[PDB]
Nucleic acid binder design. Structure first.
Ligand SMILES: [Zn+2]
Ligand SMILES: [Zn+2]
Length: 53
DNA sequence: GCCAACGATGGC
DNA sequence: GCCATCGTTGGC
């Protein structure tokens, strides 16, 4: 992907942390789905927008 | 330039 | 049709 190196810790992570702002936004964590980004811990360390990590 | 919010769509 | 999560935008 443009935003995934597929090779760092973040990219290999399969489990949302459930605790960050992005996770708390998610439907599966009871959130309003207004932000719509991946878990902070799954934000590619190389390729993600710097503000997402 | 940032970012909260949202439109878009590939993949299922 | 839905979902995950991307790129875009308007307001600051
Ligand atoms: Zn998280
Ligand atoms: Zn990565």
């Amino acid at each position: 992907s443009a935003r995934m190196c597929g090779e760092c810790e973040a990219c290999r992570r399969t489990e949302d942390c459930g605790h960050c702002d992005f996770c708390r936004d998610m439907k599966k964590f009871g959130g309003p789905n207004k932000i719509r980004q991946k878990c902070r811990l799954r934000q590619c360390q190389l390729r993600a927008r710097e503000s997402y990590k």
